[PDB]
Amino acid sequence: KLADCSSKSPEECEIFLVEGDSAGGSTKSGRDSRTQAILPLRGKILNVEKARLDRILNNNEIRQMITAFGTGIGGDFDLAKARYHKIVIMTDADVDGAHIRTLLLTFFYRFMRPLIEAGYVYIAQPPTGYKGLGEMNADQLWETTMNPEHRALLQVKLEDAIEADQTFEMLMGDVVENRRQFIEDNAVYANERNITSEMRESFLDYAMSVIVARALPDVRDGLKPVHRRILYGLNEQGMTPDKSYKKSARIVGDVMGKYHPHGDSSIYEAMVRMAQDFSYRYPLVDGQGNFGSMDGDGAAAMRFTEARMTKITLELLRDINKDTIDFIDNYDGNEREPSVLPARFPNLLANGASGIAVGMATNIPPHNLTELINGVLSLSKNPDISIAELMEDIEGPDFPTAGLILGKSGIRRAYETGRGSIQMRSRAVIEERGGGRQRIVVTEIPFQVNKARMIEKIAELVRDKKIDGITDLRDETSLRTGVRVVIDVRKDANASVILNNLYKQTPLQTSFGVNMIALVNGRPKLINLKEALVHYLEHQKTVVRRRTQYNLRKAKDRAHILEGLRIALDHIDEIISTIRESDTDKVAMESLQQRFKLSEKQAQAILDMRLRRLTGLERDKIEAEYNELLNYISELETILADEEVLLQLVRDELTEIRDRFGDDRRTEIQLG
Amino acid sequence: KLADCSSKSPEECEIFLVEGDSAGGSTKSGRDSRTQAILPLRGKILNVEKARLDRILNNNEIRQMITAFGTGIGGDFDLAKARYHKIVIMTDADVDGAHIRTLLLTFFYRFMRPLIEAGYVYIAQPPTGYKGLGEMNADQLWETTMNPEHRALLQVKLEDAIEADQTFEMLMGDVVENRRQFIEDNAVYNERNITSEMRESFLDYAMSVIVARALPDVRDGLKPVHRRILYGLNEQGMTPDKSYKKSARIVGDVMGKYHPHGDSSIYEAMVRMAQDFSYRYPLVDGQGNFGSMDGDGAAAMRFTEARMTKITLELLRDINKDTIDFIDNYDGNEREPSVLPARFPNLLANGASGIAVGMATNIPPHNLTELINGVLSLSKNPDISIAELMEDIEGPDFPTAGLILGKSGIRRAYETGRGSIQMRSRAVIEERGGGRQRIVVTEIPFQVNKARMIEKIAELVRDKKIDGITDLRDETSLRTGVRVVIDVRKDANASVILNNLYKQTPLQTSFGVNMIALVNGRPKLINLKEALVHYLEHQKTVVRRRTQYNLRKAKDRAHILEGLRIALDHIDEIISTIRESDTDKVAMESLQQRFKLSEKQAQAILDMRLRRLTGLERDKIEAEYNELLNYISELETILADEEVLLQLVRDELTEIRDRFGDDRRTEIQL
DNA sequence: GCCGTAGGGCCCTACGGCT
DNA sequence: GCCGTAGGGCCCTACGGC
Ligand SMILES: COc1ccc2ncc(C#N)c(CCN3CCC(NCc4cc5c(cn4)OCS5)CC3)c2c1
Ligand SMILES: [Mn+2]
Ligand SMILES: [Mn+2]
Ligand SMILES: [Mn+2]
Ligand SMILES: [Mn+2]
């Protein structure tokens, strides 16, 4: 792995640390092999501030760096044995590259501190605009970053040891709260280098990016960036439900190149989950082929699978090209992407969300669409509605995997505060199997529980004699039969006692820890049920309002063109003679504008008219469309002039969604 | 791995063997877990007919099967201990799935022969049209292939043990010639007999590898993967004048539309075409880490970008001018070129290496100036000899330069298609101080890994197999070029040491020429002249077809312009005719009637925008028509005289020579 | 130790002909 | 034991909450 330099005079040799072999190849080709050694790492490296010594010493990358430097570690550190006088951190020019830099600095500070004190640790500054060093040509990496004549390396300086200790503990330590507090206090939502400043700035950059642009869903459409970009890619390429399935590889490749500069595995897996009926309460992707199972089987390699939008996804994208949502520049400025989707159904709550960010995480359970829309409607008629009254519509979560929820206390607290533990229980019954013997049959399991794994845990309990009475354990699940896990009970043994033991000792009963954090105005916020519904309704009002305004500008523009076309047809002979006598388009246009009192747009539309538009009935067809337009314009102005008419329209469109996509509740909420 | 069934009564139990987890998932979701077990493998399994016994017993997939079947193997085989009465081979419905089936049968016949005799081995028949079982939904896999109610399993039967023995030996054995003879003799361009199954499945695989994978076409010098990559770049306008395009998008597009294989095969093929140490005339312009002479691979495809090189434009030029035949792609949803126009002799220019079945190919790269000069000489003399052609084509010209020793190997290769060419590194002996010397290597033989060659030298020094070497350094840099330094012990003969390096290391390496290419869709060993002849014939056809295409389009456009000219001459009457018509159809009919216009001309008139009536626009229609009449007669002149056509082929080749022709790199030393 | 978006990479097989 | 198109697949790391 270590591509060492030929010289052995440490004082003149330098080692460059890169993320992996893709970056290492450009580095190796562009380097000066006489004084420049290269050591490719393997992505995110172990955080030594959270790990114990045995884990640290046994990590491959740590070991290779220790061996490569030759100084040893901790108390045994010996600066005189350093094989290089420059250790250069040269990670990729992206937030994950910054994160890797903070991880490496954490390791150097805790295990090779005198290396920093001696001024042997440096930070390279590769240019931005590349996804990794492997995207750069070898000559460009050399000239901009590695060549000592032109490069700008940052020498890492330890100014204050006490402050550094606190900085490393706060940022990289196991105490989440202090890291969360640091983010809240420092977040702004919109040559040498001090190690402390470096750690604070690089870590904040990573933390913020994960929070606002990776792990947390937006309250408005319920989507994280990867999912939003996948659905937008599907829309842009017309991969609608009525059209044939499209190759998964083309989808991932398109999305990766145009909108999401990350690994294909993150993109493909996110798309796959959206297609799973055991993961999404209302699947957003319609998949063809092997898309995984409840047993934790992943999907088939993406070259084998195909995908397209589900019908309900069309509602997430409905009106997106009617100036309802703000588009933004993509990562490289070559494309445009939506900041948020119109989302004509409350997707955040319908499908839920799970995400591990930095300083925080989120866990929002899925809900029944009929119940949610009913809740939105009740809210729209009463801004002062209480959580309890909203619960008359929204009983609680509704998992795609069905099952049971025990009581409403966990649900109530989750809806009132955004946090609460909800007890999920499998659907199980006790039945006879012949000869006076019985069995427990499970047909539904808790949400997010891996069936194969749950079964292995039961088998483990039995094998370790931690539970009495089980004689056999079989997974009889099948496509025809549906989920069916069978647990044979010993003759004369109480099956209900065994079942109760199974709930306590296995994931047959599992808790859902609600933690409703979502992005509100681009900032993470813990929200209760009402707040979530209010932000959603407010998004719909804005979407419907902007759509109406777009349709209005569009209709007025068309009315204006038709006024120009009516004049042209009413004076067609003079229009034609005017054009024929003109040498250029400019002269024709100018002459048409003055002579017939036309705007630039009207004259141009006239010049663009094909001879076939001159047929006998066109003039009547034009005044028919014009009359219908004027009416349409009036209808649009009526909506924008009355906020109650606008709101009622939102209610009507939601009700239509409810009636077409609303379904029965799957999860039974049992009380007692 | 093994997803065993519930029941333990081998009587009713069956085990399905699939290629891997992609296929395994659909199989596991669609099966009847009570009686159906599933063991996913990992692609191509070991060929036990060519492998040694120790290796067979150590191979993980062989072990898993033996353990799953529970019978043992050879003399210790026990049919009564069988865990399943039905072992079902269910590979993917593609040629590689057929190959894996032959590999599985070979293992069963040689190590578990009683299993076959007892009727326990079966072959599933999944539907065609799917690249793998992972592409099918679980329900459709169950219904068509796994459901005992509707499935059609083929029970493998052993009729003649002596014939079977010969069959497995011939098809799967280490003797290549017999397998090649079988291919040549049989090549064509329920219950199931094991011998028939082997012969049919292996032949299906062998033929596909030969005509659609490992061998280049004589006309454009390309294998399907390379042709599909370059065509993909063409269809998405990824030309040299535009920006680099993401490699992942290129690969995704090519895989979905044309090349139904692993993305790694596509990416790596594209990468090689961008390497100036691999291609004498690179076909891909790569941005980023595209590998090195030291065997370093390219960066992951998500990091790199690519586009065509300028010379690649010449491979694709006029492809949309009905110069070459298009064919249906693998699923019938797209069209792809059977061959590229290839306006330069690419087979010989870039060469080729491919390992097929029953045969292989090894064609060295050549200098484009020399090649085109050779083609030109041939065009003036159909009876030209190989010797006269060699006055133009001195021999191979590697991208890595270096030296070739002698001309006899080259001569034999050009006359027969086979010959041994000795390549040598470019090395000199120079002083380094105090009476000491060193050997300096600046060019290495073609396809030689520099880092590996240096380690080989380091190994000889270390093991004391070579005398006189005191230091070994790779001083290569992007700014100073290739430089490998071998320091020599003071007063030792550096020339002797160099000669020894040539004997014991790849510093001297041979290139075994074996010029096999597809000629009329069939593999053929060809000599230098044949390669040039087929190439020239391809060019005459391309230029003739292009000229014919240009004529048809010119005449069509002229026809349309004649309609517009009639309309402009009588524009008032045209407008009135249309105005008095209530519908487009009536206008169409009235225009054709009153002005003796064709349907196409009438539609064109109706489609004309009012802006076309301005002075400049009217003049444009007239000007285009007059230019087009001149173009039509020039085209007719070409098609009326075969010598004029042939001369155009010469001139177009000459222009390419002048623009892309370069100096010879490899020195041929007598 | 799992949930799900992220960083990153390696090793087995067939096939022929040359060493 | 390499070369170059093919079949196939796994493991380590951050991050929070429980
Ligand atoms: C699947 O099983 C294994 C097992 C062990 C491995 N060890 C090392 C590596 C590596 N590197 C991989 C490859 C893992 N990744 C690499 C990236 C691949 N994706 C390539 C790709 C393909 C396309 C694409 C983007 N990326 O867009 C359109 S087609 C997916 C597999 C392994 C894969
Ligand atoms: Mn990176
Ligand atoms: Mn439990
Ligand atoms: Mn396959
Ligand atoms: Mn722990």
Q: Which chain B residues have a beta carbon less than 8 Å from that of A609?
A: 609-610
User: How far, in Å, is the CA of B96 from the C1' of nucleotide D6?
Assistant: 8
User: How far, in Å, is the CA of B393 from the C1' of nucleotide C2?
Assistant: 67
Strand, coil or helix: what is B605?
helix
Assess contact for A234 and A213: CB atoms under 8 A: no
Residue A323 has which token pair?
């100036």
Residue B257 has which token pair?
């539309």
> Which of B248, B571, B615 has its CB closest to that of A256?
B248
Q: Which of A193, A3, A215 is nearest to A96 (CA)?
A: A215
Distances (CA, A) of B99 to A548, B197, B378: 62, 11, 43
Chain A nearest-CA residue for B22: A300
Whether the CB of B313 is less than 7 Å away from nucleic strand C comes out as no
Residue B602 has which token pair?
């009438």
User: How far, in Å, is the CA of B264 from the C1' of nucleotide C3?
Assistant: 31
Distance from the CA of A507 to the center of ligand 3, in angstroms? 4
B301 lines ligand 1 (CB under 6 A): yes
B263 lines ligand 1 (CB under 6 A): yes
Task: Kindly state whether A127 is in contact with chain B, defined as any CB-CB distance less than 8 angstroms.
Answer: no
Strand, coil or helix: what is A52?
coil
Residues 146-165 of A with CB under 7 A from strand C: none
Best residue among A230, A264, A268 to mutate for probing ligand 1's pocket (most ligand atoms within 8 Å of CB) is A264
Q: Is B54 exposed, middle or buried (0-12, 13-18, 19+ CB in 10 A)?
A: exposed
Q: Determine which helix (DSSP H) or strand (DSSP E) holds A668, and give its type and residue range.
A: strand A668-670
Nominal resolution (angstroms) = 2.1
Residue A37, strand partner residues: A15
A300 lines ligand 1 (CB under 6 A): no
DSSP string, A637-666: HHHHH-HHHHHHHHHHHHHHHHHHH-----
Helix residue spans in B352-440 (DSSP H): 368-380, 386-389, 408-416
| Beta-carbon count within 10 A of A22 CB | 26
Using the C1' atom of nucleotide D8, identify the protein residue whose alpha carbon is closest. B43
B299 lines ligand 1 (CB under 6 A): no
Distances (CA, A) of A283 to A275, A288, A308: 5, 13, 11
Determine the Cα–Cα distance for residues A490 and A462; give it in Å rounded to an integer: 13
Q: Is A161 exposed, middle or buried (0-12, 13-18, 19+ CB in 10 A)?
A: exposed
Interface of A with B in 529-588 (CB under 8 A): 572-573, 575-576, 579-580, 582-585, 587-588
User: How far, in Å, is the CA of A592 from the C1' of nucleotide D3?
Assistant: 72
Residue A207, strand partner residues: none
| Beta-carbon count within 10 A of A407 CB | 14
Residue A195 has which token pair?
């190690």
Determine the Cα–Cα distance for residues B129 and A301; give it in Å rounded to an integer: 17
Domain A1-187: which CATH number of 3.10.129.10, 3.40.50.670, 3.40.190.10, 1.10.3260.10: 3.40.50.670
Give residues whose Cβ lies within 5 Å of ion ligand 4.
B 19, 92, 132
Residue B605 has which token pair?
């008139």
Strand, coil or helix: what is B171?
helix
Task: Encode burial over B75-85: b for 16+ CB neighbours within 10 A, e otherwise.
Answer: eebeeeebbbb
Distances (CA, A) of B47 to A255, B67, B174: 41, 19, 10
- How was this model experimentally determined? X-ray
Q: Determine which helix (DSSP H) or strand (DSSP E) holds B205, and give its type and residue range.
A: helix B194-211
Distance from the CA of A460 to the center of ligand 5, in angstroms? 21
The sign of the CA dihedral A113, A114, A117, A123 is negative
Distances (CA, A) of B411 to B395, B404, B417, B421, B526: 8, 12, 9, 10, 14
Strand, coil or helix: what is A614?
helix
Strand, coil or helix: what is A443?
strand
Whether the CB of B268 is less than 7 Å away from nucleic strand D comes out as yes
Chain B nearest-CA residue for A617: B582
Residue A164, strand partner residues: none
Determine the Cα–Cα distance for residues B510 and B517; give it in Å rounded to an integer: 21
Assess contact for B454 and B472: CB atoms under 8 A: yes
Assess contact for B632 and B551: CB atoms under 8 A: yes
> Which of A297, A475, A609 has its CB closest to that of B33?
A475
Q: Which chain B residues have a beta carbon less than 8 Å from that of A133?
A: 289
Test B31 with A478 for CB contact under 8 angstroms.
yes
Residue B667, strand partner residues: B403
Distance from the CA of A298 to the center of ligand 1, in angstroms? 14
Q: Identify each DSSP E strand in B282-359 by its residue range.
A: 284-287, 305-308, 326-328, 335-337, 352-355
Q: Is A275 exposed, middle or buried (0-12, 13-18, 19+ CB in 10 A)?
A: buried
Q: For residue A122, what are the contacts with CB-CB under 8 A and spacing of at least 6?
A: A14, A86, A87, A88, A89, A153, A154, A155, A156
Determine the Cα–Cα distance for residues B629 and B606; give it in Å rounded to an integer: 24
Distance from the CA of A45 to the center of ligand 5, in angstroms? 18
The sign of the CA dihedral B38, B41, B43, B44 is negative
Q: For residue A85, what are the contacts with CB-CB under 8 A and spacing of at least 6?
A: A10, A11, A12, A13, A14, A120
Q: For residue B593, what are the contacts with CB-CB under 8 A and spacing of at least 6?
A: none
Sheet arrangement for strand B305-308 = B245-246, B305-308, B284-287
Q: Determine which helix (DSSP H) or strand (DSSP E) holds B563, and give its type and residue range.
A: helix B528-569
Using the C1' atom of nucleotide D6, identify the protein residue whose alpha carbon is closest. B265
Q: Identify each DSSP E strand in B468-540 by its residue range.
A: 469-474, 484-488, 508-514, 516-519, 522-525
Q: Identify each DSSP E strand in A32-91 by its residue range.
A: 36-40, 86-89
Residue B242 has which token pair?
């535009």
Q: For residue B168, what are the contacts with CB-CB under 8 A and spacing of at least 6?
A: B49, B106, B109, B110, B198
User: How far, in Å, is the CA of A101 from the C1' of nucleotide C8?
Assistant: 14
Distance from the CA of B96 to the center of ligand 4, in angstroms? 6
Q: Which of A322, A369, A323, A324 is nearest to A342 (CA)?
A: A324
Residue B117 has which token pair?
């005799």
Q: Identify each DSSP E strand in B235-390 by its residue range.
A: 245-246, 284-287, 305-308, 326-328, 335-337, 352-355, 360-363
Dihedral, B87, B92, B95, B99 alpha carbons, nearest 10? -30
Residue nearest to atom 11 of ligand 1 (CA): B300
Test A583 with B614 for CB contact under 8 angstroms.
yes
Task: Kindly state whether B650 is in contact with chain A, defined as any CB-CB distance less than 8 angstroms.
Answer: no
Residue nearest to atom 28 of ligand 1 (CA): B252
Q: Which of A227, A223, A213 is nearest to A269 (CA)?
A: A227
Test A25 with B615 for CB contact under 8 angstroms.
no
B248 lines ligand 1 (CB under 6 A): yes
Assess contact for B265 and B324: CB atoms under 8 A: no
One-letter amino acid of A655: T
Residues 15-54 of A with CB under 7 A from strand D: 42-47, 50-51
Chain A nearest-CA residue for B32: A478
Task: Kindly state whether A254 is in contact with chain B, defined as any CB-CB distance less than 8 angstroms.
Answer: yes
Determine the Cα–Cα distance for residues B24 and B9; give it in Å rounded to an integer: 23
Determine the Cα–Cα distance for residues B505 and A667; give it in Å rounded to an integer: 72
Domain regions of chain A by residue span: 1-187, 215-672
Determine the Cα–Cα distance for residues B606 and B274; give it in Å rounded to an integer: 50
Residue B4 has which token pair?
């065993």
Strand, coil or helix: what is B617?
helix
Determine the Cα–Cα distance for residues B295 and B279; give it in Å rounded to an integer: 15
Task: Kindly state whether B303 is in contact with chain A, defined as any CB-CB distance less than 8 angstroms.
Answer: yes
Task: Kindly state whether A479 is in contact with chain B, defined as any CB-CB distance less than 8 angstroms.
Answer: yes
Task: Kindly state whether A299 is in contact with chain B, defined as any CB-CB distance less than 8 angstroms.
Answer: yes
Helix residue spans in B324-367 (DSSP H): 346-350
Strand, coil or helix: what is B438?
strand
Sheet arrangement for strand A470-475 = A427-434, A437-444, A485-489, A470-475
User: How far, in Å, is the CA of B60 from the C1' of nucleotide C10?
Assistant: 17
Distances (CA, A) of A650 to A375, A392, A393, A415, B615: 14, 21, 18, 24, 54
Determine the Cα–Cα distance for residues B89 and B100; give it in Å rounded to an integer: 9
Determine the Cα–Cα distance for residues B100 and B93; give it in Å rounded to an integer: 11
Distance from the CA of A251 to the center of ligand 4, in angstroms? 21
Q: Considering every ligand atom shown, identify the ligand nearest to the alpha carbon of residue A505 and give its number.
A: 3
Strand, coil or helix: what is A364?
strand
Dihedral, B252, B257, B259, B263 alpha carbons, nearest 10? 10
Residue B160 has which token pair?
């003649």
Assess contact for B266 and B229: CB atoms under 8 A: yes
Whether the CB of B538 is less than 7 Å away from nucleic strand C comes out as no
Q: Which chain A residues have a beta carbon less than 8 Å from that of B21?
A: 297-298, 300
Up-side HSE of residue B637: CA atoms within 13 Å toward CB? Answer: 9
Determine the Cα–Cα distance for residues A359 and B183; give it in Å rounded to an integer: 66
Diameter of chain A by CA atoms?
107
Q: Identify each DSSP E strand in A311-448 by its residue range.
A: 327-329, 336-338, 353-356, 361-364, 404-406, 419-425, 427-434, 437-444
Task: Report, in angstroms and rounded to the nearest whole number, the Rg of chain B calculated over CA atoms.
Answer: 32
Residue A309 has which token pair?
């939008």
Q: Which of A404, A327, A389, A360 is nearest to A180 (CA)?
A: A360
Test A34 with B475 for CB contact under 8 angstroms.
yes
